[PDB]
Design a protein around this ligand. Structure first.
Ligand SMILES: [Mg+2]
Ligand SMILES: [Mg+2]
Ligand SMILES: [Mg+2]
Ligand SMILES: [Mg+2]
Ligand SMILES: [Mg+2]
Ligand SMILES: [Mg+2]
Ligand SMILES: [Mg+2]
Ligand SMILES: [Mg+2]
Ligand SMILES: [Mg+2]
Ligand SMILES: [Mg+2]
Ligand SMILES: [Mg+2]
Ligand SMILES: [Mg+2]
Ligand SMILES: [Mg+2]
Ligand SMILES: [Mg+2]
Ligand SMILES: [Mg+2]
Ligand SMILES: [Mg+2]
Ligand SMILES: [Zn+2]
Lengths: 169, 138, 50, 336, 195
RNA sequence: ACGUCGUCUCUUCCCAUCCUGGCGGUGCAGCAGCCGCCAAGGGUGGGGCUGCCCGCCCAUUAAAGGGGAACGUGAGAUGGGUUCAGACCGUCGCGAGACAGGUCGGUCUCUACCUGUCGGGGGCGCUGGCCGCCUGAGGGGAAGGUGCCCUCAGUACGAGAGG
RNA sequence: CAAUCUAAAAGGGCGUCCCCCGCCCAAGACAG
């Protein structure tokens, strides 16, 4: 994988129609909603924290997965799976491309340089706008310090600056 | 602790250098050795300069001629005789008829039990174990 | 190495009663919250064992 | 940079290596010495030759202590210096520069001084001393102007050499002035300045060697496997990178020798009164004979075999001074 | 924040005479005399206005920020040390602690010398400043006295620093598997007044 | 038409520091080791193998750092490799031929015009000419760098070994 | 005192100036 700065900016149209894309990669995020997901038990939670994007850009699938792991592990350890609801709010629909010389990927991929430059699929990313919610947490007011810490850890894994907004439901 | 030699080492014009072949002046089994190193604070040289040693200096040697079980083995030795004339700090100019070394342990104890021929006083003063076996000191 | 309590207390105060900044290594007072030099909060207390 | 590290070839601390502006050394530094009495802080003598001597080592911690050792020695032919004038110095308040404020000359300078100086028939010394005294209260330094007496040396030339030597020994400027004035018109012998066994610095112009190549001038290597190289081997390969261009630090051929150099901490082994006891029966080669006083220095001295050499009190003496007693010179190689 | 005007007062104790001299546009020299001696302190380039009022020292700042306002408490604290310095004096106490090699501390004239620290052949020699008296009480205790608390505390700190080895000579503070290590030295243990 | 790899020679610069200087931490007892910070004044070497560069290795060593300068420097050298014409092998090609696969052989041109640098001379000026002795703005410097032995002491430390 | 043109990020800092919110103190708050 290239450094994430290579795919951070929105430089072209969304590339999502998988029926026209050969070898589009499979999404490598196993779950998107963590903790207590049933709507009845979520009624106990009365606070909402959001990790909100500050800039527009593309977040790679592995960064979303890395952010999801660190925050969910922290909440499981310190808050408890029965006392919170955490949702990864964006889905990596956009397919990333790379122009590299490769074997077993088509004859055109054997031409070097910028000849036949249209890249083969290299991964997935979510295209986000300023103010967009990346992570969404529902919790009880007693755990505010722990929820803020979990979202601070998630933010350290993401390629764009974010900010934490805490509001009641 | 062990008996100490003199703390000083005055300048001596070196007589032997890397890849010099020097006879052995003891009964340790070795007869001819190749010099492959110089040991001590005086061994350091400069670009293109080949390190060399004089009487009293310790060198690293490889046995070339001698007993079959010592051949190709790496030892330490002390220069005891030198053809290259050298000036003593009192101003006396000295030269020997031939070059010679004595095989020792890294601490300076001779491997053999006797030293043949005269031994330069520089060698005996710096290495008291050599002084013990040197019959003739010059 | 044994000292009576009066001298042991003096030695502990002077040699074992401060913090080290994990960010820059600077010695800091035992009750400090930020490093004097770089103002980091990553301070580690130095601990006397046994 | 370099493919293999090694120190540069030759010093750039003697740049430029030009011919000395004068054959007589011009001393920049004179030490402040506390001797308890006023005295000249230096002397000038002619280099006569070299010998070797058997000297008893008097350094108690030395490994050769008490032994007889052979030391190479330099013989200086040292006729008395003639004191011709006294000059006073002050500090210019604008910049702190040392500036001469006046000088008093002997009334009747010797006829040989007229070979180098434009002098009156008579100096009115008393007026000059009177004028000099007006600047006593702003004086910071006093020096005498001495002339050599080469007729009394083995060279036998007549034109003297003239130079300034300061008066030191006590911190009080007034006593130095009074001592300097008492010297007007008198001679100074080496024993009046130095004591045997003390250390001195020596300053002289070194022996001249003319135009020399880069191998001798800087010690650059002859190109290895010398026969292989077209266009010669006694040279550097390149004379620089592409940028900066020829730098002043690049070794180049040019004048070698005839430079002024200073060497430190040379021990005086003996100050003799009559040079016949040190002159070899063959004479000093390329010099002649010594008939008056001489100085025996341990070691070597810069300069050719007739150069005028300035000795001064040391400016970088070692921590431990040499023994107070005179060194024991058992024998000199010019003797039987 | 911002301070329009702020004032502090330091009461001069009985027997103490205080003179304030302006040695520049914002420089002050404060001379304090008491039964035990005279102290002189310089306050240079300062925004604090220093003045006398019938037996007090008045300290004022006008149109001041936090930086300038913070100097009122500092000057009050410094002046209070000066007043106690000329009436009661300052005594700093040090304790000599050794593990195997007993230190030998002696005062010779204006030199304080420490011998056998950790069995070293070198001798720690310190120059005792004018106005400081050092007395060795027994083999364990050192006392530094004077009227200038800054001068006295600084010298006491110098004695302690002289016995703290640095670089490659610094010993391990803890022993094998965590006990006390080689902890030898002279440690400032506290201060008090002479009277 | 800007001489194509490496090496030699020679100079300088960078610091993201291998040693040398300073300091701190340590899962720092000592002996050693590991980690961080300041610091580029000096040092960083000798050999074996390969055309090399790189790398591996040998004996030392305080340590045997890394980079830039038209991949510094062929109107300075060298010419082993690469990369002309001859030839052999393997492979490919019906063939002539081809291969950045291996191999043997294979012209390194120039009186230095300018500038630079290094040293050496003549003059004019310096407020009339000249002689001698001085001053010191500035300029150059690495003019010094770095080891070992004894003592301390078989001491501190340590259960001992060690040190 | 724009751009060509020789620059800077995530992150850390009550370093300092400032704005807002919550709570305690009704002189029985914070610090000893
Ligand atoms: Mg685009
Ligand atoms: Mg040729
Ligand atoms: Mg062209
Ligand atoms: Mg060209
Ligand atoms: Mg051309
Ligand atoms: Mg640095
Ligand atoms: Mg090139
Ligand atoms: Mg060429
Ligand atoms: Mg060229
Ligand atoms: Mg060839
Ligand atoms: Mg060939
Ligand atoms: Mg070919
Ligand atoms: Mg065929
Ligand atoms: Mg030519
Ligand atoms: Mg300078
Ligand atoms: Mg950026
Ligand atoms: Zn810090």
């Amino acid at each position: 994988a290239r450094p994430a700065r290579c795919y951070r900016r929105i430089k072209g149209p969304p590339y999502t129609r998988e029926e026209y894309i050969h070898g589009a990669p499979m999404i490598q995020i196993p779950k998107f909603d963590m903790g207590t997901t049933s709507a009845a038990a979520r009624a106990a939670f009365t606070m909402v924290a959001k990790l909100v994007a500050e800039e527009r850009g593309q977040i790679r699938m592995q960064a979303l997965e890395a952010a999801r792991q660190i925050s969910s592990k922290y909440l499981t350890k310190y808050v408890g799976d029965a006392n919170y609801y955490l949702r990864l709010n964006v889905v990596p629909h956009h397919v990333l491309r790379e122009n590299r010389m490769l074997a077993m990927a088509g004859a055109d991929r054997l031409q070097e340089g910028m000849r036949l430059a249209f890249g083969s699929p290299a991964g997935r990313a979510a295209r986000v706008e300023p103010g967009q919610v990346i992570f969404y947490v529902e919790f009880k007011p007693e755990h505010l310090a722990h929820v803020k810490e979990a979202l601070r850890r998630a933010a350290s894994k993401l390629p764009i600056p974010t900010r934490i907004v805490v509001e009641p439901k | 602790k062990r008996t100490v030699g003199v703390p000083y080492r005055f300048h001596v014009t070196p007589g032997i250098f890397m890849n010099s072949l020097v006879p052995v002046a003891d009964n340790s089994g070795a007869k001819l050795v190749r010099v492959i190193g110089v040991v001590g604070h005086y061994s350091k040289s400069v670009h293109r300069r080949i390190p060399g040693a004089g009487v009293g200096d310790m060198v690293v040697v490889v046995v070339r001629e001698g007993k079959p079980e010592l051949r190709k083995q790496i030892f330490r030795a002390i220069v005891v005789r030198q053809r290259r004339p050298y000036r003593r700090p009192d101003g006396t100019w000295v030269a020997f008829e031939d070059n010679a070394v004595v095989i020792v342990t890294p601490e300076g104890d001779p491997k053999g039990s006797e030293i043949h021929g005269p031994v330069a006083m520089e060698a005996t003063l710096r290495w008291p174990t050599i002084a013990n076996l040197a019959s003739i000191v010059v | 190495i044994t000292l009576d309590p009066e001298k042991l207390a003096i030695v502990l105060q002077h040699r074992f009663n401060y913090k080290i900044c994990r960010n820059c290594g600077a010695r800091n007072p035992p009750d400090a919250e930020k490093c004097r030099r770089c103002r980091s909060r990553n301070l580690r207390p130095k601990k006397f064992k046994k | 940079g370099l493919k293999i590290n090694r120190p540069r070839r030759g010093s750039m601390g003697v740049y430029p290596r030009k011919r000395a502006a004068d054959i007589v050394p011009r001393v920049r530094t004179w030490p402040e010495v506390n001797l308890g009495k006023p005295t000249l802080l230096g002397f000038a003598a002619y280099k006569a030759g070299m010998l070797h001597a058997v000297v008893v080592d008097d350094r108690p911690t030395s490994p050769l202590y008490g032994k007889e050792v052979v030391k190479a020695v330099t013989v200086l032919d040292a006729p008395p210096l003639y004191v011709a004038a006294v000059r006073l110095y002050t500090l210019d308040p604008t910049n702190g520069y040392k500036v001469a404020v006046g000088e008093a000359w002997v009334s009747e300078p010797p006829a040989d001084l007229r070979r180098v100086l434009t002098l009156p028939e008579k100096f009115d010394t008393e007026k000059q001393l009177k004028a000099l005294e007006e600047y006593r209260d702003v004086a910071v330094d006093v020096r005498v102007l001495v002339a050599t007496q080469p007729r009394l040396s083995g060279i036998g030339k007549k034109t003297p050499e003239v130079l300034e030597i300061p008066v030191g020994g006590v911190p009080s400027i007034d006593e130095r002035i009074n001592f300097a004035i008492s010297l007007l018109g008198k001679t100074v012998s080496p024993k009046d300045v130095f004591t045997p066994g003390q250390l001195v610095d020596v300053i002289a112009v070194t022996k001249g060697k003319g135009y020399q190549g880069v191998v001798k001038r800087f010690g650059v290597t002859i190109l290895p496997r010398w026969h292989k190289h077209r266009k010669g081997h006694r040279r550097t390969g390149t004379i620089g990178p592409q940028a900066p261009a020829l730098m002043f630090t690049q070794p180049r051929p040019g004048q070698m020798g005839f430079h002024q150099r200073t060497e430190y901490n040379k021990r005086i082994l003996k100050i003799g009164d009559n040079g016949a006891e040190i002159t070899p029966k063959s004479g000093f080669p390329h010099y002649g004979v010594i008939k008056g006083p001489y100085i025996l220095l341990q070691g070597s001295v810069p300069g050719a075999r007739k150069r005028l050499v300035v000795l001064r009190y040391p400016v970088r003496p070692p921590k431990k001074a040499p023994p107070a007693a005179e060194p024991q010179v058992v024998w000199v190689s010019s003797q039987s | 924040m911002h301070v329009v005007y702020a004032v502090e007062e330091v009461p001069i104790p009985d027997g103490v005479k205080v003179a304030i001299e302006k040695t520049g546009p914002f420089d002050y020299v404060v001379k304090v005399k008491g039964p035990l001696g005279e102290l002189v302190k310089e306050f240079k380039n300062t925004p604090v206005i220093m003045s006398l009022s019938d037996g007090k020292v008045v300290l004022e700042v006008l149109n001041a920020k936090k930086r300038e306002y913070a100097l009122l408490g500092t000057y009050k604290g410094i002046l209070k040390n000066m007043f106690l310095g000329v009436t009661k004096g300052w005594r700093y106490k040090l304790k000599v602690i050794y593990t195997h090699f007993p230190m030998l501390v002696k005062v010779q004239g204006n030199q304080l010398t420490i011998e056998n620290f950790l069995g070293r052949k070198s001798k720690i020699v310190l120059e005792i400043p004018k106005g400081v008296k050092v007395e060795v009480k027994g083999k364990e205790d050192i006392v530094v006295e004077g009227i200038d608390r800054e001068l006295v505390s600084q010298f006491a700190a110098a004695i302690q620093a002289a016995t703290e080895l640095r670089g490659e000579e610094k010993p391990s503070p803890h022993g094998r598997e965590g006990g006390l290590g080689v902890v030898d030295g002279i440690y400032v243990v506290g201060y008090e007044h002479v009277k």
